[PDB]
Design a protein around this motif. Structure first.
Motif, PDB file in Angstrom:
ATOM      1  N   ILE C  85       0.842  -1.195   0.000  1.00 22.02           N
ATOM      2  CA  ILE C  85       0.000   0.000   0.000  1.00 22.02           C
ATOM      3  C   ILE C  85       0.878   1.246   0.000  1.00 22.02           C
ATOM      4  O   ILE C  85       0.538   2.252  -0.624  1.00 22.02           O
ATOM      5  CB  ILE C  85      -0.936   0.041   1.221  1.00 22.02           C
TER       6      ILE C  85
ATOM      7  N   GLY D  12     -13.931  -1.762 -18.677  1.00 25.23           N
ATOM      8  CA  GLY D  12     -12.772  -2.480 -18.206  1.00 25.23           C
ATOM      9  C   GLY D  12     -12.622  -2.085 -16.756  1.00 25.23           C
ATOM     10  O   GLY D  12     -13.064  -0.998 -16.365  1.00 25.23           O
ATOM     11  N   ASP D  13     -12.016  -2.961 -15.958  1.00 22.45           N
ATOM     12  CA  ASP D  13     -11.812  -2.709 -14.532  1.00 22.45           C
ATOM     13  C   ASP D  13     -13.073  -3.015 -13.720  1.00 22.45           C
ATOM     14  O   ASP D  13     -13.048  -2.969 -12.494  1.00 22.45           O
ATOM     15  CB  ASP D  13     -11.380  -1.253 -14.287  1.00 22.45           C
ATOM     16  N   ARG D 256     -14.520  -5.500  -1.629  1.00 23.12           N
ATOM     17  CA  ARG D 256     -13.138  -5.102  -1.718  1.00 23.12           C
ATOM     18  C   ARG D 256     -12.648  -5.072  -3.170  1.00 23.12           C
ATOM     19  O   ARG D 256     -11.874  -4.185  -3.569  1.00 23.12           O
ATOM     20  CB  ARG D 256     -12.290  -6.026  -0.864  1.00 23.12           C
ATOM     21  N   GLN D 257     -13.104  -6.041  -3.960  1.00 23.82           N
ATOM     22  CA  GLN D 257     -12.720  -6.099  -5.361  1.00 23.82           C
ATOM     23  C   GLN D 257     -13.144  -4.819  -6.081  1.00 23.82           C
ATOM     24  O   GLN D 257     -12.344  -4.221  -6.800  1.00 23.82           O
ATOM     25  CB  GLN D 257     -13.368  -7.291  -6.015  1.00 23.82           C
ATOM     26  N   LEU D 260     -11.002  -1.758  -4.581  1.00 22.42           N
ATOM     27  CA  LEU D 260      -9.647  -1.755  -5.123  1.00 22.42           C
ATOM     28  C   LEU D 260      -9.674  -1.500  -6.622  1.00 22.42           C
ATOM     29  O   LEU D 260      -8.758  -0.896  -7.176  1.00 22.42           O
ATOM     30  CB  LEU D 260      -8.950  -3.081  -4.846  1.00 22.42           C
ATOM     31  N   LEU D 261     -10.724  -1.976  -7.278  1.00 25.21           N
ATOM     32  CA  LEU D 261     -10.854  -1.771  -8.712  1.00 25.21           C
ATOM     33  C   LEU D 261     -11.233  -0.327  -9.028  1.00 25.21           C
ATOM     34  O   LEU D 261     -10.830   0.205 -10.062  1.00 25.21           O
ATOM     35  CB  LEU D 261     -11.888  -2.723  -9.296  1.00 25.21           C
ATOM     36  N   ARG D 263     -10.180   1.978  -7.470  1.00 21.30           N
ATOM     37  CA  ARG D 263      -8.988   2.645  -6.958  1.00 21.30           C
ATOM     38  C   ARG D 263      -9.120   3.376  -5.622  1.00 21.30           C
ATOM     39  O   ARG D 263      -8.353   4.302  -5.342  1.00 21.30           O
ATOM     40  CB  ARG D 263      -8.422   3.596  -8.010  1.00 21.30           C
ATOM     41  N   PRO D 265      -8.430   4.010  -1.916  1.00 21.70           N
ATOM     42  CA  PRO D 265      -7.280   3.714  -1.055  1.00 21.70           C
ATOM     43  C   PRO D 265      -7.432   2.549  -0.082  1.00 21.70           C
ATOM     44  O   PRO D 265      -8.307   2.555   0.778  1.00 21.70           O
ATOM     45  CB  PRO D 265      -7.029   5.044  -0.354  1.00 21.70           C
ATOM     46  N   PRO D 266      -6.560   1.529  -0.213  1.00 25.92           N
ATOM     47  CA  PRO D 266      -6.570   0.339   0.640  1.00 25.92           C
ATOM     48  C   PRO D 266      -6.251   0.651   2.091  1.00 25.92           C
ATOM     49  O   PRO D 266      -5.372   1.464   2.387  1.00 25.92           O
ATOM     50  CB  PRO D 266      -5.488  -0.537   0.022  1.00 25.92           C
TER      51      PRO D 266
ATOM     52  N   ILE F  24     -14.743  -8.319 -24.885  1.00 25.18           N
ATOM     53  CA  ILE F  24     -13.751  -8.733 -23.902  1.00 25.18           C
ATOM     54  C   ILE F  24     -13.648 -10.256 -23.905  1.00 25.18           C
ATOM     55  O   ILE F  24     -14.659 -10.945 -24.017  1.00 25.18           O
ATOM     56  CB  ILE F  24     -14.113  -8.199 -22.479  1.00 25.18           C
ATOM     57  N   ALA F  42      -9.089  -7.907 -22.923  1.00 24.57           N
ATOM     58  CA  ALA F  42      -9.229  -7.736 -21.481  1.00 24.57           C
ATOM     59  C   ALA F  42      -9.948  -6.451 -21.072  1.00 24.57           C
ATOM     60  O   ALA F  42     -10.552  -6.394 -20.001  1.00 24.57           O
ATOM     61  CB  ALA F  42      -7.857  -7.782 -20.827  1.00 24.57           C
ATOM     62  N   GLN F  43      -9.880  -5.427 -21.918  1.00 23.55           N
ATOM     63  CA  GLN F  43     -10.514  -4.143 -21.621  1.00 23.55           C
ATOM     64  C   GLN F  43     -10.798  -3.293 -22.863  1.00 23.55           C
ATOM     65  O   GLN F  43     -10.095  -3.386 -23.865  1.00 23.55           O
ATOM     66  CB  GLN F  43      -9.614  -3.311 -20.693  1.00 23.55           C
ATOM     67  N   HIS F  44     -11.835  -2.463 -22.781  1.00 19.71           N
ATOM     68  CA  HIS F  44     -12.175  -1.539 -23.856  1.00 19.71           C
ATOM     69  C   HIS F  44     -11.786  -0.141 -23.365  1.00 19.71           C
ATOM     70  O   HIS F  44     -12.573   0.560 -22.720  1.00 19.71           O
ATOM     71  CB  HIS F  44     -13.667  -1.589 -24.176  1.00 19.71           C
ATOM     72  N   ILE F 267      -4.774  -2.543  -8.661  1.00 22.76           N
ATOM     73  CA  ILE F 267      -4.291  -2.408  -7.288  1.00 22.76           C
ATOM     74  C   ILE F 267      -4.454  -3.709  -6.527  1.00 22.76           C
ATOM     75  O   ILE F 267      -5.578  -4.148  -6.286  1.00 22.76           O
ATOM     76  CB  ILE F 267      -5.074  -1.313  -6.533  1.00 22.76           C
ATOM     77  N   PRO F 275      -7.315  -8.355  -6.659  1.00 26.98           N
ATOM     78  CA  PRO F 275      -8.581  -8.027  -6.007  1.00 26.98           C
ATOM     79  C   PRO F 275      -9.542  -9.139  -6.354  1.00 26.98           C
ATOM     80  O   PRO F 275     -10.286  -9.661  -5.510  1.00 26.98           O
ATOM     81  CB  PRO F 275      -8.987  -6.725  -6.696  1.00 26.98           C
TER      82      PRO F 275
END
Ligand code: ANP
Ligand code: ANP
Ligand code: MG
Ligand code: MG
Lengths: 159, 466, 94, 479, 128, 466, 128
Positions: C85, D12-13, D256-257, D260-261, D263, D265-266, F24, F42-44, F267, F275
């Motif tokens: 972190i 995405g994400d 949590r996914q 964190l995805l 973004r 802060p952890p 995807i 994997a992503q657009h 992350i 994650p």
């Protein structure tokens, strides 16, 4: 820690200090089991010099092994053979300490300077068993192995 | 002037203004909404846009929605008509008893008393709790903090302190529920109407209740403390009375701050918290205080996440306290209640010149034998007690009777202890211990000192055991 | 907690653990609990007690090691998590 | 048209960036091309972040997005009973459409202070250990925490299966509609779960919201909330419900996914700062309404999986600091044969006492104490008599699976152990004695059980007779 | 000012930890990347810069001085933590207090074992 | 539709498609390379640009190099002709035995069976291996954690299982070498050939090999478990079989996941994993269960990080296991084969309601007698095995007969052991140990039960050896 | 070259630990995405492709071989650390060295219980 761990390989000789050691009032607080040198080879310092060095290190490592065993049992269980090494470890441990001319203001004693040969002899004899009749304190903070006996004497008379 | 929402992320809402930009802290009212939705201006992003924090859910908001500038921070009712009522972050009543017709209103944001308004008077506040009374007495006008992990003892203690203190109190109290259990407010409310500290008919009520439980969004839980705080300030200053301010869990104020800090655009500090943890906290704790104009005996329950006292939150809370009562799960698990840590709870009042040398000398006698027993626990776990001197065994024994003699049955917990509550006096507590130490009861069995009031009841229970 | 410290107590208690188990056997073959304790305050037995003592002592250490190790890993995981972190906050601050 | 529509700028994400939707509401349900649904999470100046409730790999740049004009909600009602649906309320048991005629936002905020009253009606789990030492009340929240494979899920299943004896009654005020949410588990287990529930004839008064390990995070993230709204239906309309969030531990890592995805802060154990709010808002919705608000209620038995019995872990302590007690299930007790493996000394019911029947109170009141004395001492006739009671009472709390007892039978079986009609018996048999003793009372004494079921109390009249029934049984007991 | 006019001043920085805290908060809101436990890159320089100013001037500069007693707080007694080691490796020694010696009755809870003065004798009157 | 590579940063590649944009998970074919370079979507990213993870090196790629949208995800050859063949990540044969002439093809990315397609019956997959079937039954359609490093009988137990399941269940098997070492991957291939499971001549091969070498990028190593998964699925949904899926090192799948995750700049969660950990594990693991058509049981070798069971990887993996086969050198030394630990290996399904009360009480009796005998070891050695009561002398003896009866000669060992392998039906094993426990066979020597099959061969072996 | 020409070569990579350290520096300086210990996500892919390159070729390809001996510097013996983990897996075995065994006298300092070659007796003449 990255900083120091990365600095080692850049040295040809390392002298590691140890809070643990300093705490036992031993100076320089050099770790005997963590200080190494590139020339610590029998074919560069001879066989006599080398053997004694490793002989020191070994008895000191054995003594660490008994630190545990006696940590629960007490000084009365080790065979007369082991308790004998414990008694030499202490002396060899203490004989590694040495007053510095630069550290007078600290210790309060007169800094001594030991010649190499007098150092080997010094530890060669202690490992031999010769000074098993002298008290440990006799070897603490001195110069050549002699002062030890001398101090040991000044120690006998005072008692 | 009219402002318009330009962005919404959870509880952070950016409002753009075309004319007249609302200053920081100013409370904006979101338009087109069923119930009042307040946004608090937190910063000026530039480009005539302000970033705010919602004091309620932000569901349904639409970009372009109009936001009004009230022209002032969040103002809540303060005065005697708050007493007996229950209010939320923004001062709206939530007890289904109609508007709260107070003359004056007060901003929930204010600067802390100046250095020249500080009070240096220390005067113990006996509580009837042997462990607190003894080792870390509470102080009238002081800042008492009660640290405890999930399910250890904070609440029950705050309740007992409201029982043993609040009732025998000649003045006004303010209880602030912050991020805790709603059914608890429910409990409190109905326990107060019973005892009568709250009266729904005659205007004799003595408690003002502010609530923003764990059901509330971050912006609320993040400000509720200031509201309860502000209601306490009125009673203190604008009336000069001795004010009691209970706050069940001020840790929630910080926790909440972390949820929103994230969304505010702040790089995170250690452990994910916000950078402003320390300051944010300061500007609040500093208002919770006694001045020359009046007193405030504050009791704050403090949650220790993951039972870690080093967590930035609690850690940062100790310096703001005059007295600390640290609760331990390990102690609670040995069935010692209150799970107070004899060796980690402190009071600035634990001074011989203040509580007497007899009191101070016994207190230190107790923290010494327990300290010495604690240092022996290393040996006890491996080699049992057959490897301890005769001297050692003696302390171990007295420590164990002292530990237990430190427990105590509170009224508010009778259901879990199966014993009638007990309120021990100060002298009785000093005495009880002076004796166990002097070896006066080295013949009684441990279990005899467990869960009892004075020392006398330690003896009674001994005979019964035969 | 500190990985350095825990690692110190684990090693130290794993050692103790080994020495106590060894003593339990010697005793078996042949500190002795509250044996010398009782008679003073007032073999078969002596060894009995010593067997028992080291035994319990042996378990008591293992139950202690078993608890230190869990704390080891919890804390081991935490340190990695922390280091990471920190590593990212700096990157996301660029 | 960009007021009620929008094209997907990126996918995405796990979050889909939509262009347009100038009129969407934060937390509003939206529909993609592929039929998949989402929620407006982030409203920004030039786009909208949409949490996607399902496989987001099915969304591509350019896709049309439409407003449903509504804040995320789900179907609600009695027609959901005996059904199996996903987080969104879509039936998944092949049995066809849902006859739902009402809806309810999943994010409704919980009842405030006023509309509540201390739990007071029994939430009989049918489990001896629970219903006697850790008595739950209707409207309370009792965390079920313990390690993997400790018996958590049972505590709950036996509970649902127990209600049947009530729902097949006439008095709606004693029935207990049930709701079992499945978060992060394996479909098979759910499959195996309802199938079980069906056999026990429990599913008819049970809703099962499922968001398994295959479902996108958000779905799992959501599930608990939807099941709550459904539970709230009964709560607020005078009925009583019991919702089981089979481990929020998994709804937490699912959240949590997304955190964190997105973004965020952890923090502690990488979780976001709001993993607590996540569980506190959900669980605050479980409650006991007072008469002026219907008198109904919603009891929630959430489940938390600990790691190596470490209840001090982050999440474990959050939930603990939300619920009204914990039922600790010890791994060592389990593999040792103690089932249910309820670590009594650690478990609690901060609010179930008042709610406990006067019947138990009597016997169980003395039993918590006798197990107290026993827990302490665990020669001398004094303590010897305590250790004897202890190992017997302990074997009493031992119970099988899928066979919840009736509150009156319990007081009967417990009644034995407390008064002492087991002192002279040997441990290894106490269980064999139980099965025999209980099947005996059931058969030859419906009256006594009925008077106790009806008086919820073991009156002096019921007591004397219950003493007889036990004494004259020991005689004819075959060691 | 005193140290530069043949006078001696004793300064007490009651809590450099909090000072480090505030410094971090400021740096964070100035958008500079964070670091160990989130402090700035130059937290070391934060204190080393301040403590060096303490000093004994020679007679040519007035011969005055400024001695500092910065106070550092540790958690769970970890002299082996960031800031704590940051300052320690700066000052000419340190007085360590411990809670253990405090309850045993050793007040002031000074643990000689870890407490040193890199001045030692150099700073003591004949008689004492 | 054709795209143009616009970004290459290690195993990550971003391609811009002017018109039709590839969904995807859609495989893209890089144009202009010697071998085949597949890029899995994997992503657009937006702007007609998509990001991807390469399944092989990316050296040589140039911005602008053409790229083809294969229309769907990575498709591989499925069907009988894959058995005996070693398949690559993307479906290519790597056993150099030329093409994999199949008429069928499938995508490696397939949603798991729906809730209705679920089996609600708990059946036990008979392996014919005593210890397994008696103390830790393999849930048909369940995952089993194979514990044990190397040199403990792993490669032998794997094939034997392949054999048995084939002989007694008609189902084939697939081996997904996730992160395999090219060296052991080769060794396994031939070790299997010389074992019979694979035949380079007559179509009698019972297993399909799929490999994901370590030298292969994280993208590649992450998908293999799925490629091999897709292969096994064909035999379950197309031929109604009860397949067996072997994932050696499910851990390296996980790790493979984190590396992809990191490469994609996501992350990390606690302990540095992805994650998506649980979902990555969900989407795949869930494709392994019993369907109305048939079922797939999978034996996945597990690596516990730092010997920590709580580490995310395993702990995320234990949520999907129904059993664990633990190999032990301690066992292997005693000459007991398979070296399956009878007390550390376990099963969820080992419940009366599932394996029958009878089967249950037997497995339990054996577990308890071993537990009893394992304790005695102390006394026996020290206090001497001379003061053992009748009940103490039988335990040790019987336990030893049991303990050895737990050994079994594998048919795949015939090649070297020179002993006809044995496949024990569940019926024979239960009664075998059921009796031993009674004492019916106490008048027999130990070696009589060592290395045999049904209980019969125990007595027959006894007389011969007298 | 030797591996492809029937000849056999033994290659020693003195601490891949240091190589990894260099790779990371470039990675983080280009701003790729940092992971555990700040190492890039394909650090494993860095050593895997290098370590596989070693091989005992078949008589058809000449019979040549490239044997590898990479070195890993652990910290305080932590092998459960990122790179050590990595390599440990990637390779075929381990010869564990230790200080205690050293100053003890056991030189070379190899831990027979912890060290292990999976190839074992395969490359050990019957004489041995
Ligand atoms: N004084 C006490 N006597 C007996 N039991 C107690 C006492 N204090 C706490 N407990 C026990 O601990 C439980 C809950 O304590 P409680 O007062 O709610 O803790 P808390 O600090 O408020 N924790 P939480 O709000 O969940 O973070 C009670 O149900 C009791 O079983
Ligand atoms: N009361 C009980 N008596 C006997 N066996 C039980 C009982 N409760 C549970 N079990 C057994 O324990 C197993 C699994 O328990 P389960 O209800 O799933 O526990 P859990 O804590 O929810 N673990 P899991 O969901 O797998 O993480 C079942 O297969 C049963 O055989
Ligand atoms: Mg509380
Ligand atoms: Mg469960």
């Amino acid at each position: 820690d990255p900083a120091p761990a990365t600095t080692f390989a850049h040295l040809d000789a390392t002298t590691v200090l140890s809070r643990a050691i300093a705490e036992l009032g031993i100076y320089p607080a050099v770790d005997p089991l963590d200080s190494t040198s590139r020339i610590m080879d029998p074919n560069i310092v001879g066989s006599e010099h080398y053997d004694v060095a490793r002989g020191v290190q070994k008895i000191l490592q054995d003594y660490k092994s008994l630190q545990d065993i006696i940590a629960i049992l007490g000084m009365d269980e080790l065979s007369e053979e082991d308790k004998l090494t414990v008694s030499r470890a202490r002396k060899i441990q203490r004989f590694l300490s040495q007053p510095f001319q630069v550290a007078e203001v600290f210790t309060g004693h007169l800094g001594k300077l030991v010649p190499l040969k007098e150092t080997i002899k010094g530890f060669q004899q202690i490992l031999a068993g010769e000074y098993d009749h002298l008290p440990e304190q006799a070897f603490y903070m001195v110069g050549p192995i002699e002062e030890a006996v001398a101090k040991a004497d000044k120690l006998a008379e005072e008692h | 002037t009219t402002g318009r929402i330009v962005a919404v992320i959870g509880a952070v809402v950016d409002v753009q203004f075309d004319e007249g930009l609302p200053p920081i802290l100013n409370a904006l009212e979101v338009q087109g909404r069923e119930t009042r939705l307040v946004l608090e201006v937190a910063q000026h992003l530039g480009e005539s846009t302000v970033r705010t924090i919602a004091m309620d859910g932000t569901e349904g908001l639409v970009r372009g929605q109009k936001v009004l500038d009230s022209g002032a921070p969040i103002r809540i009712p303060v005065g005697p008509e708050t007493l007996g009522r229950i209010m939320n972050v923004i001062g709206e009543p939530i007890d289904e008893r109609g508007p709260i017709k107070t003359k004056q209103f007060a901003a929930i944001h204010a600067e802390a008393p100046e250095f020249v308004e500080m009070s240096v008077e220390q005067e113990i506040l006996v509580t009837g709790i042997k462990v607190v009374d003894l080792l870390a007495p509470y102080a009238k006008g002081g800042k008492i903090g009660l640290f405890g992990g999930a399910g250890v003892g904070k609440t029950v203690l705050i309740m007992e302190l409201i029982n043993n203190v609040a009732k025998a109190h000649g003045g006004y109290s303010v209880f602030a529920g912050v991020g805790e259990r709603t059914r608890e407010g429910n409990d409190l409310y109905h326990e107060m109407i019973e005892s009568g500290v709250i009266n729904l008919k005659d205007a004799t009520s003595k408690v003002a209740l502010v609530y923003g439980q764990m059901n509330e969004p971050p912006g609320a839980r993040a400000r509720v403390a200031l509201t309860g705080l502000t209601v306490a300030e009125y009673f203190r200053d604008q009336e000069g009375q001795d004010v009691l301010l209970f706050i069940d869990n001020i840790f929630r104020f910080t926790q909440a701050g972390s949820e929103v800090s994230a969304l505010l655009g702040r790089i995170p500090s250690a452990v994910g918290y916000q950078p402003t943890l320390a300051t944010d906290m300061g500007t609040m704790q500093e208002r919770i205080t006694t001045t020359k104009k009046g007193s405030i005996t504050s009791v704050q329950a403090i949650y220790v996440p993951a039972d870690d006292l080093t967590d930035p939150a609690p850690a940062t809370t100790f310096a703001h306290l005059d007295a600390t009562t640290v609760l331990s799960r390990a102690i609670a698990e040995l069935g010692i209640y209150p799970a107070v840590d004899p060796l980690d709870s402190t009071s600035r009042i634990m001074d011989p010149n203040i509580v007497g040398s007899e009191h101070y000398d016994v207190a230190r006698g107790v923290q010494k034998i327990l300290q010495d027993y604690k240092s022996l626990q290393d040996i006890i776990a491996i080699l049992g007690m057959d490897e301890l001197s005769e001297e050692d065994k003696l302390t171990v024994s007295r420590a164990r009777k002292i530990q237990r003699f430190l427990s105590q049955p509170f009224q508010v917990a009778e259901v879990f202890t199966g014993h009638l509550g007990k309120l021990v006096p100060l002298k009785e507590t000093i005495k009880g211990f002076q004796q166990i130490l002097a070896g006066e009861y080295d013949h009684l069995p441990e279990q005899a000192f467990y869960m009892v009031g004075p020392i006398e009841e330690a003896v009674a229970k001994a005979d019964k055991l035969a | 907690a500190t990985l350095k410290d825990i690692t110190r107590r684990l090693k130290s208690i794993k050692n103790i653990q080994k020495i106590t188990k060894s003593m339990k056997m010697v005793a078996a073959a042949k500190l002795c609990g509250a044996i010398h304790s009782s008679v003073a305050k007032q073999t078969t037995s002596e060894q009995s007690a010593r067997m028992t003592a080291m035994d319990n002592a042996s378990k008591n250490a293992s139950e202690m090691i078993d608890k230190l190790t869990l704390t080891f890993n919890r804390t081991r995981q935490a340190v990695i998590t922390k280091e990471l972190i920190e590593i990212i906050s700096g990157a996301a601050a660029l | 048209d960009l007021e009620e529509t929008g094209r997907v700028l990126s996918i995405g994400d796990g979050i889909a960036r939509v262009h347009g939707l100038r009129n969407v509401q934060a937390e509003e349900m939206v529909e993609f091309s592929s039929g998949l649904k989402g929620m407006s999470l982030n409203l920004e100046p030039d786009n909208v972040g949409v949490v996607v409730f399902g496989n987001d790999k099915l969304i591509k740049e350019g896709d049309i997005v439409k407003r449903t004009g509504a804040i995320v909600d789900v179907p609600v009602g009695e027609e959901l009973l005996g059904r199996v649906v996903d987080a969104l309320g879509n039936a998944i048991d092949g049995k066809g459409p849902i006859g739902s005629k009402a809806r309810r936002r999943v994010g409704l905020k919980a009842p405030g202070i006023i509309p509540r009253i201390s739990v007071r009606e029994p939430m009989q789990t049918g489990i001896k250990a629970v219903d006697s030492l850790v008595p739950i009340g209707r409207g309370q929240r009792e965390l079920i925490i313990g390690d993997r494979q400790t018996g958590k899920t049972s505590i709950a299943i036996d509970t649902i299966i127990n209600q049947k004896r009530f729902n097949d009654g006439t008095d709606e005020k004693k029935k207990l509609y049930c709701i079992y949410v499945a978060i992060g588990q394996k479909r098979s287990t759910v499959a195996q779960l309802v199938k079980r529930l069906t056999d026990a004839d429990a599913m008819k008064y049970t809703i099962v919201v499922s968001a398994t390990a295959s479902d996108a995070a958000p779905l799992q993230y959501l599930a608990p909330y939807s099941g709550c709204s459904m539970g709230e239906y009964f709560r607020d309309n005078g009925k009583h419900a019991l919702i089981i969030y089979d481990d929020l531990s998994k709804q937490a890592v699912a959240y949590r996914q997304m955190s964190l995805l997105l973004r965020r802060p952890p923090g502690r154990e990488a979780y976001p700062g709001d993993v607590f709010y996540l569980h506190s808002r959900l669980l605050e919705r479980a409650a006991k309404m007072n008469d002026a608000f219907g008198g109904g209620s919603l009891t929630a038995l959430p489940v938390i999986e600990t790691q190596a019995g470490d209840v001090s872990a982050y999440i474990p302590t959050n939930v603990i600091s939300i619920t009204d007690g914990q039922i600790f299930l010890e791994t060592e007790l389990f593999y040792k044969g103690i089932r249910p493996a309820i670590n009594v000394g650690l478990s609690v019911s901060r609010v179930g006492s008042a709610a406990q029947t006067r019947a138990m109170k009597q016997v169980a009141g003395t039993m918590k104490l006798e197990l107290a004395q026993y827990r302490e001492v665990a020669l001398d006739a004094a303590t010897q008599q305590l250790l004897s009671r202890g190992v017997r009472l302990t074997e009493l709390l031992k119970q099988g699976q899928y066979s919840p007892m009736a509150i009156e039978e319990q007081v009967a079986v417990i009644y034995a152990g407390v008064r002492g009609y087991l002192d002279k018996l040997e441990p290894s048999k106490i269980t064999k004695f139980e099965n025999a003793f209980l099947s005996h009372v059931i058969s030859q004494h419906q009256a006594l059980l009925g008077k106790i079921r009806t008086d919820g109390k073991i009156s002096e009249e019921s007591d004397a007779k219950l003493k007889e029934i036990v004494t004259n049984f020991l005689a004819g007991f075959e060691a």
